[PDB]
Design a protein around this nucleic acid. Structure first.
Ligand SMILES: [Mg+2]
Ligand SMILES: [Mg+2]
Ligand SMILES: [Mg+2]
Ligand SMILES: [Mg+2]
Ligand SMILES: [Mg+2]
Ligand SMILES: [Mg+2]
Ligand SMILES: [Mg+2]
Ligand SMILES: [Mg+2]
Ligand SMILES: [Mg+2]
Ligand SMILES: [Mg+2]
Ligand SMILES: [Mg+2]
Ligand SMILES: [Mg+2]
Ligand SMILES: [Zn+2]
Lengths: 216, 104, 129, 86, 208, 128, 21
RNA sequence: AGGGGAUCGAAGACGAUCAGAUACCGUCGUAGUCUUAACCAUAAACUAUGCCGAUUAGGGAUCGGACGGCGUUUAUUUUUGACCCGUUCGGCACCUUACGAUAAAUCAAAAUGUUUGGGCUCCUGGGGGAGUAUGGUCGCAAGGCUGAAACUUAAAGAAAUUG
């Protein structure tokens, strides 16, 4: 509720406004362990729960019930993430799940289909991912068509900012939780493909943690 | 499912091996599958060693040894408590147990 | 027995590149293989390559510089007209902007884009991107 | 990187591994930077000018990064007769 | 000599110090990755490491050390008894934190433990006995320099110093020489030829 | 007859904070503890005094791991600067004949590096 | 029970929110 | 169909146990168990993992052949044989590891597959009915090979977790 006390060096640096934006943190691949980092840079992040499911466990009296929650976050302009958490009571699960969703926000790469006319709208390449017997593939699509996908993964693609794509699924897609994790891995690998336009060598610079001096 | 990688037999590179007779129930098991124990002991027990010594007529005497090699089926193996059930991770350990050399 | 020296060469290159090596060795060397390597070189996907000449068949040692994703071969050499050549580029290339499909025609073996510029067709032998 | 009219449109441009050339993805923990100081004629270390290298987690995990560093240092004239091809 | 002058060649006294502590004796096992750092294997005996490559690799490690802005960001680890005193004296002479004995796993990952640290560099005596430190270092992107013998894992170790790694005198001598180089490259010693006033036996171990 | 954690922690903290004012005699520690502490039970005060007087009986005869008091630490860093006058590695004084012993390919290594002037004697080693 | 809690909470944005009659 | 027939022992006959015991336990005991000349062609015939070819990681054992070396032992003694150190070819296997694969157990192949094409042959499509009926074919017979339909059902099944 009230103003937060930094625990890490990065937290102190953000508090002093010594770092510009998230893209250098992404460039240097630094771990994030505190959810106030994301919302200090990115307001208006929409969150939306998929469903809540009970889980059992046998005990002397009977069966012990816990509740599992599915939560994803996104800004519809290139940032998306999800979190999974179970707890003994539903309400705790939703708030705690939101924290992991904020902690797992990643950037996406958006490309062109054919000719370029500003505001990239589709995937740069075709990418796919697998998580335990579920495979989801994304294909670039021409401008104008809508999203052709299941209702579950259409929301994730809508919140990721991708405008045109083709989708195909294989394996046992009945596991909704696994399906979302497979789509998230496929989107996570968009920046992992080396297109020919990235062949130019880049210059390495020292990280903000190294070249800044933290407060006591 | 495989409970053991070697099928509990120790036989790779051949098709057949002649069986043997269990020393307790007279069952037939393959020789490579049976459990083999070699035992070396004295003819007489340690309390009787002196009684034989002073009842001998050869001044100092050395009692002879006795040598046996017993072999059992697995059904008689864990009923005679020669070997016992081990844990899942402890199954894959074929080093002989370290016999106590101090006995407290 | 050995049924595709081209397949052996591309498979060895793909394995070494995926595992991060810098040099590759190819046991059998042929004219079609070298003509394929020159196409790769003209687009910068590889570096120097050397063909040692023993009297049996010769060998190849290629120098890698990263930058290469995958290079495969189609084993049954289909017959493709000029009009349906865009089916294949729609099928087995991540995007139209980059990537090449290697063809064999009466004017030598060549990539699909300048082969389209030459307005010629033939048989398909492989691809790389 | 993509372009439409000469202006950058990519959200950010990632870096490349020095040992293998693979791009280091975001959230790829296990990728490190190595900074090398610069010495003067009398042996003191001048402050603020340094040489930077980057290694990915993939190349680090199998463990040849020590030899890759030897290769890069020898190429940049930091070491003598430590790396060679048999 | 693009980035190094000729004053960094090892002096005869230094090589003397090296060959007086039997730091050139290895184990029967020969790792494949340490093959470059092998002179020859003894006929009916152990491998022999090349001390000449040791000198530059030690200098390079010192050049890594100096690049850190404030010395308090460097952390040095030791678990075996033979390196406790040498690591602590290294921590006192330079600026660095030292962890001797048990490591308390979760130090680099959990932010509520008492021994919570955010280092920029890690120095390890032995990768085999300090595998946990390297394993947790692999999660948050910190380079490690470590002392290695002829047989030793090279998992996630950017810089390796070839040494005996098991002798009583060798570990202390190497830690002492590394500290000397760090001070020499800074302005503390002020001169390459002048000798240091601390005795090498100070970085040793005593039974009681 | 095993003492719980509350006594274990109270005995350790009292011993390390206030070492010299109390001794091996149980009677003295009985009156020492309650004056310098706030304890709500008489038997619990007895529990602490009885166990705490046990510690100094074994500390008096050799130190024990897990316990450190003000007098004890200061002894460590005074003793840890011990250093001889002649180095154990140094052999010009330690060995009567300054020249030392190495093996053949070590001498060859010296030949490669150029430090030929070191006076050493080479002896072959082989068993086979 | 899980369905009951989701409507009851009235503090989160669900995928589909029913409108009474 | 002949020879041989010690020992075990289907069928069978007794003694116990048991409420019953045509069984488990004990004493006997025919065909059979062996061999010569001909049939039969099925087994959890199992590595439940087809055959040829290429590449991919560290280790130390071990069987056969060849090559190099410091020594010991020993003989009508040397060269040979035995032991020791290192390299290589071809096998039956093993330990660690995952950059990889799978639902998982686990795997140097079960890897190089959504970024899907090295060559060839065979087999399967929810569970029962059913390897059944019928036709054909081989066999002295026992049986082998090939092989349905009517009807019925919302679950059978695999790997792992807590009790
Ligand atoms: Mg065989
Ligand atoms: Mg068989
Ligand atoms: Mg007749
Ligand atoms: Mg007959
Ligand atoms: Mg009977
Ligand atoms: Mg009988
Ligand atoms: Mg059959
Ligand atoms: Mg079969
Ligand atoms: Mg078979
Ligand atoms: Mg020989
Ligand atoms: Mg079932
Ligand atoms: Mg089951
Ligand atoms: Zn038995």
């Amino acid at each position: 509720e009230k103003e937060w006390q930094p625990v890490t060096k990065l937290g102190r640096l953000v508090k002093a406004g010594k770092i510009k934006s998230m893209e250098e943190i992404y460039l240097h691949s630094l771990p994030i362990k505190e959810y106030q980092i994301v919302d200090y840079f990115l307001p208006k992040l929409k969150d939306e729960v998929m469903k809540i499911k009970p889980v059992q466990k046998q005990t002397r009296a009977g069966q012990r019930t816990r509740f599992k929650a599915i939560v994803l976050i996104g800004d519809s302009d290139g940032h998306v993430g999800l979190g999974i958490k179970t707890s003994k009571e539903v309400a705790t699960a939703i708030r705690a799940a939101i924290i992991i969703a904020k902690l797992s926000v990643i950037p996406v790469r958006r490309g062109y289909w054919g000719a370029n006319l500003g505001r990239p709208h589709s995937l740069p390449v075709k990418q796919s991912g697998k998580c335990g017997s579920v495979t989801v593939r994304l294909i670039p699509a021409p401008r104008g068509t809508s999203l052709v996908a299941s209702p579950a993964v259409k929301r994730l693609l809508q919140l990721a900012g991708i405008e045109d794509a083709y989708t195909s699924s294989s394996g046992s897609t009945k596991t909704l939780e696994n399906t979302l994790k497979a789509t998230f891995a496929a989107v996570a690998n968009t920046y992992g493909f080396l297109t020919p336009n990235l062949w130019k060598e880049t210059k390495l610079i020292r990280s903000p943690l190294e070249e800044y001096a933290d407060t006591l | 499912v495989k409970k053991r990688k070697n099928n509990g037999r120790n036989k790779k590179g051949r098709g057949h091996v002649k069986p043997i007779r269990c020393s307790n129930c007279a069952r037939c098991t393959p020789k490579d599958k049976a459990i083999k124990r070699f035992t070396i002991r004295n003819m007489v027990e340690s309390a009787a060693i002196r009684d034989i010594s002073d009842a001998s007529v050869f001044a100092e005497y050395t009692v002879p040894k006795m040598y046996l090699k017993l072999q059992y089926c697995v059904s008689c193996a864990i009923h005679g408590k020669i070997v016992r059930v081990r844990s899942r991770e402890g199954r894959r350990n074929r080093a002989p147990p370290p016999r106590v050399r101090y006995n407290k | 027995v050995r049924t595709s020296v081209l397949h052996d060469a591309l498979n060895s290159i793909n394995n070494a590149e995926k595992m991060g090596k810098r040099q590759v060795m190819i046991r059998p060397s042929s004219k079609v293989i070298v003509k394929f390597l020159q196409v790769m070189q003209r687009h910068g996907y590889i570096g120097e390559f050397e063909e040692v000449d023993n009297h049996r068949s010769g060998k190849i040692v290629v120098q890698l510089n990263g930058r290469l994703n995958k290079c495969g071969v189609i084993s049954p050499r289909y017959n493709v007209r000029l009009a349906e050549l865009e089916k294949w580029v729609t099928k087995l290339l991540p995007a139209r902007q980059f990537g090449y499909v290697i063809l064999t025609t009466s004017a030598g073996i060549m990539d699909h884009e300048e082969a389209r510029r030459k307005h010629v067709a033939g048989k398909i032998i492989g691809f790389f991107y | 990187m993509e372009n439409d009219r000469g202006e950058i449109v990519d959200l950010y441009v990632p870096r490349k591994c020095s040992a293998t050339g693979r791009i280091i993805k975001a959230k790829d923990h296990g990728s490190c930077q190595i900074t090398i100081a610069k010495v003067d004629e009398n042996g003191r270390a001048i402050q603020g000018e340094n040489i930077i290298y980057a290694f990915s987690g993939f190349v680090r995990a199998m463990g040849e990064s020590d030899d890759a560093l030897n290769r890069l240092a020898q190429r940049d004239g930091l070491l003598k007769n430590v790396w060679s091809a048999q | 000599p693009a980035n190094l002058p000729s004053i960094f060649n090892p002096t005869s006294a230094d090589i003397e110090q090296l060959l007086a502590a039997q730091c050139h004796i290895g184990s029967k096992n020969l790792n494949v990755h340490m093959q470059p750092y092998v002179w020859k294997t003894r006929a009916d005996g152990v491998n022999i490491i090349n001390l000449g490559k040791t000198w530059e690799k030690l200098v390079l490690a010192a050049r890594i050390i100096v690049a850190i802005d404030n010395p308090s960001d460097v952390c040095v680890i030791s678990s075996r008894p033979f390196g406790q005193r040498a690591v602590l004296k290294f921590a006192a002479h330079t600026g660095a934190q030292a962890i001797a004995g048990r490591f308390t796993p979760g130090s680099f990952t959990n932010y509520i433990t008492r021994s919570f640290k955010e280092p920029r560099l890690i120095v390890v005596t032995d990768p085999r006995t300090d595998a946990q430190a390297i394993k947790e270092a692999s999660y948050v992107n910190i380079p490690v320099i470590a002392l290695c013998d002829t047989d030793s894992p090279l998992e996630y170790v950017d810089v390796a110093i070839p040494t005996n790694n098991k002798g009583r005198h060798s570990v202390g001598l190497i830690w002492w020489m590394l500290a000397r180089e760090v001070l020499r490259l800074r302005g503390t010693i002020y001169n390459r030829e002048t000798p240091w006033d601390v005795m090498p036996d100070l970085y040793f171990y005593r039974d009681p | 007859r095993v003492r719980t954690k509350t006594v274990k922690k109270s005995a350790k903290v009292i011993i390390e904070k206030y070492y010299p004012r109390l001794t091996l005699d149980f009677e003295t520690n009985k009156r020492v503890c309650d004056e310098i502490a706030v304890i709500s039970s008489k038997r619990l005060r007895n529990k602490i005094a009885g166990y705490t007087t046990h510690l100094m009986k074994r500390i008096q005869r050799g130190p024990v791991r897990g316990i450190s008091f003000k007098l004890q630490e200061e002894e460590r860093e005074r003793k840890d600067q011990y250093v001889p006058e002649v180095s154990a590695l140094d052999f010009h004084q330690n060995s009567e004949t300054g020249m030392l012993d190495i093996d053949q390919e070590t001498k060859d290594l010296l030949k490669h590096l150029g430090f030929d002037s070191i006076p050493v004697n080479v002896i072959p080693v082989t068993q086979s | 029970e899980g369905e009951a809690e989701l409507k009851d909470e009235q503090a989160a944005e669900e995928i589909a929110q029913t409108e009474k009659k």
